[PDB]
Design an enzyme around this catalytic site. Structure first.
Site, short mmCIF file in Angstrom:
data_model
loop_
_atom_site.label_atom_id
_atom_site.label_comp_id
_atom_site.label_asym_id
_atom_site.label_seq_id
_atom_site.Cartn_x
_atom_site.Cartn_y
_atom_site.Cartn_z
N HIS A 295 0.89 -1.15 -0.05
CA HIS A 295 0.10 -0.02 -0.18
C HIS A 295 0.85 1.18 0.01
CE1 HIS A 295 -3.23 2.69 1.36
NE2 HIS A 295 -2.37 3.26 1.91
N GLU A 296 1.77 1.21 0.84
CA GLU A 296 2.66 2.56 0.98
C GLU A 296 3.50 2.61 -0.12
OE1 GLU A 296 2.07 4.85 2.89
OE2 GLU A 296 0.71 3.66 4.13
N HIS B 149 1.54 4.33 -2.82
CA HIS B 149 1.66 5.89 -2.63
C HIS B 149 2.87 6.43 -3.23
CE1 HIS B 149 -2.00 6.68 -0.48
NE2 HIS B 149 -1.67 6.10 0.69
N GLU C 295 -6.21 7.91 -1.14
CA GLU C 295 -6.68 6.67 -0.63
C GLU C 295 -7.10 5.88 -1.02
OE1 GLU C 295 -4.40 5.78 1.53
OE2 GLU C 295 -3.95 7.65 2.76
O1 LIG Z 1 -3.69 5.11 4.69
C1 LIG Z 1 -2.94 5.29 5.32
N1 LIG Z 1 -1.38 5.29 5.09
O2 LIG Z 1 -1.09 5.43 3.80
C2 LIG Z 1 -3.50 5.37 6.83
C3 LIG Z 1 -3.35 6.83 7.14
C4 LIG Z 1 -2.80 6.66 8.77
O3 LIG Z 1 -3.77 5.82 9.56
C5 LIG Z 1 -5.35 6.23 9.21
C6 LIG Z 1 -6.18 5.29 8.76
C7 LIG Z 1 -7.66 5.36 8.46
C8 LIG Z 1 -7.89 6.77 8.50
CL1 LIG Z 1 -9.69 7.13 8.12
C9 LIG Z 1 -7.23 7.64 8.93
C10 LIG Z 1 -5.81 7.63 9.29
C11 LIG Z 1 -1.98 5.37 8.60
N2 LIG Z 1 -2.64 4.47 7.56
S1 LIG Z 1 -2.34 2.80 7.76
O4 LIG Z 1 -1.29 2.56 8.20
O5 LIG Z 1 -2.41 2.13 6.20
C12 LIG Z 1 -3.65 2.37 8.77
C13 LIG Z 1 -3.22 2.33 9.98
C14 LIG Z 1 -4.25 1.52 10.97
C15 LIG Z 1 -5.36 1.04 10.51
CL2 LIG Z 1 -6.70 0.45 11.63
C16 LIG Z 1 -5.94 1.08 9.05
C17 LIG Z 1 -4.93 1.81 8.40
ZN LIG Z 2 -2.57 5.10 2.39
#
Ligand SMILES: O=C(NO)[C@@H]1C[C@@H](Oc2ccc(Cl)cc2)CN1S(=O)(=O)c1ccc(Cl)cc1
Ligand SMILES: [Zn+2]
Length: 395
Positions: A211-212, A215, A237
């Site tokens: 996922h990262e 990005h 996202e």
């Molecule tokens: O999308 C992410 N990174 O690219 C998110 C943002 C941050 O976190 C979030 C997650 C959801 C929302 Cl609405 C806001 C902030 C980090 N994660 S993540 O590491 O991918 C992640 C972390 C925990 C959960 Cl429970 C789900 C996704």
């Molecule tokens: Zn993300």
């Protein structure tokens, strides 16, 4: 093998792929030990108190964030043994991504996505942007500037908050103007989060890393979507996750970006055609013109002039924004994952994927021909509870 050197944290600094470095923050940091795991890709086993000086405190904010789940531990990743395990976990996750055809393609796109050399004030002159480099220490304590695309670094205060970030320019929007910029991924292989499908499951950290990286692909090619375009969850996202949520962006709206980035690649092509000089010692102007020809898949005639092929562009664009999605990696890993971006639960787990008895490049948690291999029992935080130590949510 994407990473052919199996580094150990205490390995001697050989100055080439193991060294003390500083990142281009201008916060006069102390050099940290880093490991070059692949061309253009470095790993830094440290908590990230560097990319943003506004946050050098690994301590909780007075009230817990409502969502998503947060976790704090100011001592996590403070020891050479954790740093060594972090290093080995990150490395194993790269191999797992690489072991798939989707990932192999993503990693290649990342390695060739060199940030554009738009550093000079003279439009006819190519120049590297310094915030796209790292300073590497020499035996005599002098620093050599080295270019790179990607740095994997440990998380900041909130240990479970993974993110792709990068240094900005005073005038340019590097992640949204086709240029691209070096990407810093806050990430830990040592923790993960849960989701329900009751039935309580853990996210495979390879999916999170991918996922990262997705990005990072967007931002390396300067086609990221402005984070102020939400609907709250941002388009960037939605696009990255893919699947059902991806189509929350109607086709017409998508065609706006599709063209908005066609003309951004158009400009880069012209800046390239009009270049007459270059800064630095090692790279010739033709060499760099070539690098950027590969990155953006430009078309070149016999007289060495560049242009943007609209069919080549479309393939690259959709490849980075539609084919490179978390949803698609999920299919390639053959693992279980939440169905919507927000369909997670407030559960965070301590995990350890280094030992092969817990997690493998090919299977992940769902080890083949065992109990874990059936119905993603490997990812079931109750059935395979020996691999998911549930942690105290922060509040
Ligand atoms: O999308 C992410 N990174 O690219 C998110 C943002 C941050 O976190 C979030 C997650 C959801 C929302 Cl609405 C806001 C902030 C980090 N994660 S993540 O590491 O991918 C992640 C972390 C925990 C959960 Cl429970 C789900 C996704
Ligand atoms: Zn993300």
């Amino acid at each position: 093998g994407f990473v052919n050197k199996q580094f150990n944290y205490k390995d001697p600094v050989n100055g080439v792929d193991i060294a003390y470095i500083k990142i281009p923050n201008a916060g006069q940091m102390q050099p940290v030990k880093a490991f070059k795991i692949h061309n253009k890709i470095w790993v830094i086993p440290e908590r990230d108190t560097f990319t943003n000086p506004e946050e050098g405190d690994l301590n909780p904010p007075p009230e817990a964030k409502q969502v998503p789940v947060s976790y704090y531990d100011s001592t996590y990743l403070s020891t050479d043994n954790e740093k060594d395990n972090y290093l080995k976990g990150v490395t194993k996750l790269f191999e797992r991504i690489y072991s798939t055809d989707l990932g192999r393609m993503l990693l290649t796109s990342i390695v060739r996505g060199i940030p554009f050399w738009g550093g000079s004030t003279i439009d006819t002159e190519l120049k590297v942007i310094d915030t796209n480099c790292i300073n590497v220490i020499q035996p005599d304590g002098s620093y050599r500037s080295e270019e790179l695309n990607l740095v994997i670094i440990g998380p900041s205060a909130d240990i479970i908050q993974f993110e792709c970030k990068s240094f900005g320019h005073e005038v340019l929007n590097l992640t949204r103007n086709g240029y691209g910029s070096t990407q810093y991924i806050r990430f830990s292989p040592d923790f993960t989060f849960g989701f329900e499908e009751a039935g309580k499951f853990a996210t495979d950290p390879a999916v999170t890393l991918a996922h990262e990286l997705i990005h990072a692909g967007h931002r390396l090619y300067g086609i990221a979507i402005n984070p102020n375009r939400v609907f709250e969850v941002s388009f960037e996202e939605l696009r990255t996750f893919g699947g059902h949520d991806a189509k929350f962006i109607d086709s017409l709206q998508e065609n706006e970006f599709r063209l908005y980035y066609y003309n951004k690649f158009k400009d880069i092509a012209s800046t390239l055609n009009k270049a007459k000089s270059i800064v630095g010692t090692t790279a010739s102007l033709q060499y760099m013109k070539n690098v950027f020809k590969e990155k953006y898949l430009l078309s070149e005639d016999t007289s060495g002039k560049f242009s943007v092929d609209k069919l080549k562009f479309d393939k690259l664009y959709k490849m980075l924004t539609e084919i490179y999605t978390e949803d698609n990696f999920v299919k390639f890993f053959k693992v279980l994952n939440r169905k919507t971006y927000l369909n997670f639960d407030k559960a965070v787990f301590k995990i350890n994927i280094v030992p092969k008895v817990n997690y493998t490049i090919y299977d992940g948690f769902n080890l083949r021909n065992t109990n874990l291999a059936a119905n993603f029992n490997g990812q079931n935080t109750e059935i395979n509870n020996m691999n998911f130590t549930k942690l105290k949510n922060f509040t």
